[PDB]
Design a protein around this nucleic acid. Structure first.
Lengths: 91, 321, 78, 102, 97, 93, 108, 97, 78
DNA sequence: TCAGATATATCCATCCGA
DNA sequence: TCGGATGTATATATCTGACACGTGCCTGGAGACTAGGGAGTAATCCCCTTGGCGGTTAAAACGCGGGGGACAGCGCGTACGTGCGTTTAAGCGGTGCTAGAGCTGTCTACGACCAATTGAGCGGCCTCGGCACCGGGATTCTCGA
DNA sequence: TCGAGAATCCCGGTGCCGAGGCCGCTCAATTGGTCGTAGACAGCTCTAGCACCGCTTAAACGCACGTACGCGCTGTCCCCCGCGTTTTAACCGCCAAGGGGATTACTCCCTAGTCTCCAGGCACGT
């Protein structure tokens, strides 16, 4: 089936080149990714509906990420998201 | 003196190549069969045959079981398997391989009758193979092969006098028969630095020599051709002819590589590597102290290629090994 | 009737892994009520969610979804 | 690839398809997959890096589930992120009260 | 032979089972309990083994958490033995009472 | 401008409940809040269940399942007891 | 074209019906909204509101006041058992707390 | 000359406060505290009065819950007065660390 | 230093409304700290949700929504 | 088809408070 | 004093790479190109927050008991861990048997869409009666006796 | 048990403002048609659940014994409930004042949708 396993393995290899991953660990990581995506999407949708707009855009996702994530992680994530958005928009 | 063991390993390798789709097993089984058949002695024990290269624990065990029981339970089970036999039969026709045979057997196409009834399920190459599978299965006599080679050389010379045609392979090596025709073509205007092959194909088809075409490109063209009958005898079977156009700086190397034999080619490559040169189908290149290959040497004759590796030139009749 | 299956040494081991020092008498019996209450309040909703799909066998995803709707998410069981 | 063009790691098209078909909003924006993928990658990288530090400290050579549990429960930020989530065969952090000890 | 100190065995193996990742519960009894509790809701429902294992895992987690919280709360009583009143107070203050 | 509420329906239902009762405006506000909260919770549960079953449209069976899943205990047994009797009336057509 | 009857009038329900269908359709909560779902949701809302209001009226009649007060409503809501479970984390504005005192601390 | 019992007026005060439903916190101090606390995060924020009232309501509810929890726990501690250690334990048990 | 605004009479009255009998002499600082923690953890998200609207005024319904997110859902106002 | 590594068990030469 | 517990040397349980090249097939997700409907932009009321000044007084700060609760310590005994010898069910594989999960092709009843048609709920405005507040009265609980 | 004095219930004699009464008025709910498809159903195949059987053995059970920690009891002293007294800033009354939020008409441009378009992997055959 389709999951995030391949991308997870690639990211783990990039992060550290001398480690191994159990299959149960891969499943745990897949569940974590799915849960985080669902929570962020739900918060964004609720914020969008409450704001009396009609679409989901980058600013909404950024505000939701600020609302949900813990502090220092939120700051680092906001920086990374801004940098990636600049990179993609520079295309 | 291992004809029976070689025959059984032939079916084992065919199963591993076309049914099991195991190149790493098919090559090993073929090598073990060749080592068994090349030994001019009867195999008495599997341990005795394990001394010869290419025979391992599995090969020795199979030889011992074949000696003890006269056959293999696995071999008999694979012979009695309808699906495996259907796959082998479907892959036996050229143009259909392991996956083609598997798809045909999965779709119910298991005999040549289904293939004739499903020609729409057969491509141009597949339909051509289905039309003349028995004709492709027949060998080419040395007289018929020589007549076809003379006709092809005449057509090449008439198309362009600058064209050079070489009948390489066992025909060059002098064998009494061949399963197909392998022609190497050269031209002064086409070197290492496109319609000559198309013109050659058109010239061959104009005299009604080439009967069918499976693929025709600017480099290699493959088709089915047959020596004509003299209006009263039976028609000659269709034979597969492949003509490859090579550069003038590469024609000699290609002819040397395709003339054979495989053992002779391997020995020549080993001697060249021991002589500080690398010999390929394209050209021959110098080898450095660190093994970096230099600019390939110009090639003009087989004798020059033999002298490049500091080895005596050998006639194709003596090129068995 | 099978509720007495959980051995006293077993519950003692569980609590010891929890970080206790001494277990009195009545607690061994009293733990049964908590275990049964939690298990029932889970299994009933799990079976309801299973039956809502007009199936017949309890599926693992059903238990996962029920636990999530029960406010306790346990990631890892697929 | 679009994710490759953005230099991301996860398949951005998959996220775009999931969000579009997820019935979560009326209209899909412009670069939402990019930001979502970046956030996911940053979180996954942080979790994996903490796990790798713990594993190197563990003198082992594979991501055991207990290693992941210890890594997640050993740092305050991750503890707040997933405090009310359980893991399988993970165990608990080693701790004993000082008053009880002899 | 050598009589160990009072609770020396008890204080021991706390580190051993603390690092454990096993289930620490008899399996077939848990399956029987699950089936018996299930028998009251609907009639003759089949179950999958992985689901039973996961249910056991969640149950172990919840019980461990409750017992540990009860011990911590009873520590505030300046007592060294956990008692049923302590677990009662822990459940009541937990908000799930 | 204009905004939506359930004040008139609440007043009618209260009159049906008892002909001799009063209530303040803040009571109407609290009642509106309770109604909105319950409706939102039910809708969310229904959408989640429908996605889990991977169907495409919301039917009354899904609503019944969600109501059985959400409401606390025996009251739901009474509550669902009305709904089918309610539904049958519309099924009376 | 005779005098058409509303859906609630057709099926004998009190709370709004059509507006519920509009809200569900515009709520983006599903791909397609069915028929019986609005009826069932409206009926359930009616039953719950009726139960709460009846408890409130009983409380107010006990307290001898003609108009329902927010504190009376809060006391009625928190007094029962099932409603307490269903509304276990809601703080009613200017509601108050149930009159109760600890027994052990009481002088004796 | 006539004074009540040493702690009898406390029970009457408890009854009187329990019966009532007033605000119990002076509005001006709460408004000032809200302004001061909000000054740190963002500058020049202008609120509406209803928001201040609602924030007062929620704060009162949270404090009441914490105090009731502390009283129940201290009662479980076989002590009469309420001390900060009990408040810390109550905040720890509910999971508010 | 407006945190000293919550007076000793106010804290005592609130605790009595909770039903307390005897309050020790070391409670004021703890109560002030707890109140500060709760007010901050609500108001930060309140201001964030307000700013997401790109408006310069904090609305009461914004406070209600923020309280709902933090696990209060206090009905009534708004 | 095959060993070559590589991760993974023990154990019995030590070390310590208990 | 010694059993539980840290390493290093040594032997099992798994994982694994050792032809590729030329020539055709074969599809699942990138670009190209609207449109029209959703979002940005400028102008104007306004009302609702903001700020300010003065009396006013109920509310809050502060000093002073004494006395009742927090705490500290002592004996004691009885519930509870600890060692040991037995035992029953839990694993650990087998073995066979099959209801039921899952998947695939009709087709059809039903849900979305739309243009008239209309009237139930919303906005705006009275009013008198539920509610309210003192105010003095009588009624009742209690803590030193 | 008992009284003096404080906390509590009550009739009413007033006010008073706002909850519920009314009307005037549209834009959303209804009707009656249409089309275009999601799942209802009928019919199939393949497996993970289910049911024993015998062996091994190891965790579990029952029973003796010492001991310590829970649980009474005691005195002791210190901080806090209650009291009275002297300040004061919330609180209510009034005022102005202006700016950020609603609205409303206008214009722009960005994703849903449709439709090519492909080259990055599969095979034959060696």
């Amino acid at each position: 089936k389709e999951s995030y396993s391949v991308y997870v393995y690639k990211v783990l290899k990039q992060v550290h080149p001398d480690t191994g991953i159990s299959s149960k660990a891969m499943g745990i990581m897949n569940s974590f990714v799915n849960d985080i995506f669902e929570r962020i999407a739900g918060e964004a949708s609720r914020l969008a509906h409450y704001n009396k707009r009609s679409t989901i855009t980058s600013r909404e996702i950024q505000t939701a990420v600020r609302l949900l994530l813990p502090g220092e992680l939120a700051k680092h994530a906001v920086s990374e998201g801004t940098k990636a958005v600049t990179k993609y928009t520079s295309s | 003196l291992n004809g029976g063991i070689t025959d059984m390993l032939t079916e084992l390798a065919n199963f591993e190549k076309n049914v099991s789709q195991a190149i790493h097993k098919y090559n090993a089984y073929r090598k073990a069969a060749s080592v068994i058949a090349k030994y001019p002695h009867k195999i008495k024990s599997g341990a005795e045959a394990k001394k010869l290269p290419g025979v391992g624990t599995k090969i020795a065990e199979k030889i011992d079981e074949f000696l003890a029981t006269g056959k293999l339970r696995k071999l008999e089970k694979i012979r009695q398997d309808d699906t495996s036999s259907s796959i082998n039969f479907l892959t036996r026709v050229s143009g259909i391989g392991p996956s083609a045979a598997r798809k045909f057997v999965d779709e119910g196409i298991k005999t040549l009758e289904d293939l004739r009834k499903n020609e729409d399920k057969l491509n141009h190459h597949q339909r051509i193979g289905l039309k003349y599978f028995g004709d492709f299965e027949k060998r080419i006599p040395r007289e018929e092969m020589l007549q076809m080679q003379d006709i092809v050389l005449n057509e090449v010379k008439k198309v362009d006098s600058e064209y050079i045609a070489t009948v390489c392979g066992s025909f060059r090596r002098g064998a009494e028969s061949s399963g197909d025709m392998d022609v190497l073509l050269t031209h002064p205007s086409f070197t290492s630095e496109p319609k000559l092959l198309h013109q050659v194909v058109e010239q061959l088809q104009k005299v009604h020599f080439i009967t069918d075409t499976l693929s025709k490109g600017e480099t290699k063209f493959m088709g089915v051709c047959q020596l004509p009958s003299k209006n009263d005898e039976k028609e000659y079977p269709h034979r597969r002819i492949d003509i490859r156009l090579i550069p003038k700086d590469q024609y000699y190397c290609g002819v040397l590589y395709f003339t054979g034999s495989d053992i002779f080619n391997k020995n020549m490559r080993a001697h060249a590597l021991e002589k500080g040169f690398t010999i390929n189908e394209y050209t021959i290149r110098p080898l450095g102290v660190t093994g970096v290959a230099g600019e390939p040497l110009p090639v003009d004759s087989e004798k020059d290629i033999f002298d490049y590796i500091q080895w005596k030139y050998r006639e194709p009749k003596d090129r068995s090994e | 009737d099978n509720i007495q299956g959980i051995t006293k040494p077993a519950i003692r081991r569980l609590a010891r892994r929890g970080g206790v020092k001494r277990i009195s008498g009545l607690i061994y019996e009293e733990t049964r009520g908590v275990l049964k209450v939690f298990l029932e309040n889970v299994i009933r909703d799990a079976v309801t969610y299973t039956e809502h799909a007009k199936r017949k066998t309890v599926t693992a995803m059903d238990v996962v979804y029920a636990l999530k709707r029960q406010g306790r998410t346990l990631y890892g069981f697929g | 690839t679009r994710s490759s063009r953005a230099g991301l790691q996860f398949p951005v098209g998959r996220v775009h398809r999931l969000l579009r078909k997820g019935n979560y909003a009326e209209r899909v924006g412009a670069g939402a997959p990019v930001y979502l993928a970046a956030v996911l990658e940053y979180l996954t990288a942080e979790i994996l890096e903490l796990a790798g530090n713990a594993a190197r400290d563990n003198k082992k050579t594979r991501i055991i589930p207990r290693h992941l549990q210890l890594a997640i429960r050993n740092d305050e930020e991750l503890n707040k992120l997933l405090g009310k989530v359980t893991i399988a065969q993970g165990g608990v952090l080693p701790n004993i009260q000082a008053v009880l000890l002899p | 032979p050598h009589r160990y100190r009072p609770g020396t065995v008890a204080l021991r193996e706390i580190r051993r089972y603390q690092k454990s990742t096993e289930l620490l519960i008899r399996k077939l009894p848990f399956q029987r309990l699950v089936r018996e509790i299930a028998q009251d809701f609907k009639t003759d429902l089949r179950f999958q083994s992985s689901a039973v294992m996961a249910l056991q895992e969640a149950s172990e987690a919840y019980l461990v958490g409750l017992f540990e919280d009860t011990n911590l709360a009873a520590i505030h009583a300046k007592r060294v033995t956990i008692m049923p009143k302590d677990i009662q107070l822990a459940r009541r203050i937990r908000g799930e009472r």
